[PDB]
Amino acid sequence: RQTFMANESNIERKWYVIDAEGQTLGRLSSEVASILRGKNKVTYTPHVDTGDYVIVINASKIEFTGNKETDKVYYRHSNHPGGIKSITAGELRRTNPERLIENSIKGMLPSTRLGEKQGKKLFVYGGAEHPHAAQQPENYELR
Amino acid sequence: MFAIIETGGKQIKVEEGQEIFVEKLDVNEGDTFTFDKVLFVGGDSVKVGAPTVEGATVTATVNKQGRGKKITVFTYKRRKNSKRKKGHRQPYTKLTIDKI
Amino acid sequence: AVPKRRTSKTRKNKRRTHFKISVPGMTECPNCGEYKLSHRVCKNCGSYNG
């Protein structure tokens, strides 16, 4: 047995700044998901977090295809009888653009105690100004 | 420096002065073994490719010859009155690398 | 009506967490010297001096 194992004494996490200006929603969330999980590092370990931090700017300028701006709706239940609400994807982009990308990427992560910790390394903004300049974020191009 | 050696159907990454555990070999205690098949010679020095570097053998010294810790094998099937119990101990050979 | 399952020791000891006894309010008497319940009369001497 000689397989390597990563611990919290040799892991390095960096900060990225991705831009969502003119990008497809589903095809952009699938790439950010692998970064938050650390699927791009050669020292990947399953039982420990090894991903990095990601910052999404220009979220309000995401793109859809076809008529999905009206046919795609989001439901939610309040646990009360008959308490089911709804909202269309087109109306949500115009009010809460950050919750649109935040929930689209959270659904591509595992629903475990470690997956909830990896989903907090994400930051989404509707403009181009982020307050995390101290973290020294580095630009990233989608593949 | 290091090298990949094939011994018992597996491959290993050995350095000079390291302990390893392989399948039961033919040599007895205190003898000297020699790894005929070397797949890779790594490090910063001159490396080589494949399938097998002709020559560049490895030398070791046999230290011990024992049996791994006992393993218990049990199986059953519900509602059928069928069970089985077994014991197992895997033999091994402990070596020590001398020079690559 | 009747318990479906028996109660385990782990569950029984958590319910008895708040089943504790209280420590009374006692202070040293100015004249008796023994301990006394506040606003009561010293059993040892009999003085209150309100």
């Binding site: 050669v42 | 494949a50 399938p51 | -």
Partner: protein, 116 residues
């Protein structure tokens, strides 16, 4: 003659209670409940010894794919290239090299990418 049952029953039940050390609650004290968990743990270990060899091979391929894509190449195209040159290095050793020795791992990618 009469053969009474003594000292043979308690010796067999105590060997089962010692194999259940660490279990929760009555599963490490009572015999009938601890006897059923030791039987199920033996069936679990028999199955996990075979799954153990699938979970580690799945991890070596995940690390080789991450290093191969650092040279702008896929895992499927790198494995094919290595096979053509007859290198014959398993995935457990390619993983151990890509992690520590990078310049050595880079030589295997040019030799494999030359064979197309």
């Amino acid at each position: 003659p009469r053969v009474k049952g003594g000292t043979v029953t308690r010796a067999r039940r105590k060997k089962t209670i010692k194999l259940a050390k660490g279990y929760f609650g009555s599963k490490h004290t009572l015999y009938k409940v601890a006897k059923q968990q030791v039987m199920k743990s033996g069936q679990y270990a028999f199955r996990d010894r075979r799954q153990r060899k699938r979970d580690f091979r799945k991890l070596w391929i995940t690390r080789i794919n991450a290093a191969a894509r650092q040279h702008e190449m896929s895992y499927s195209r790198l494995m094919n290239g290595l096979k053509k040159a007859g290198i014959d290095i398993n995935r457990k050793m390619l993983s151990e090299i890509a992690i520590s020795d990078e310049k050595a791992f880079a030589q295997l990618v040019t030799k494999a990418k030359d064979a197309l």
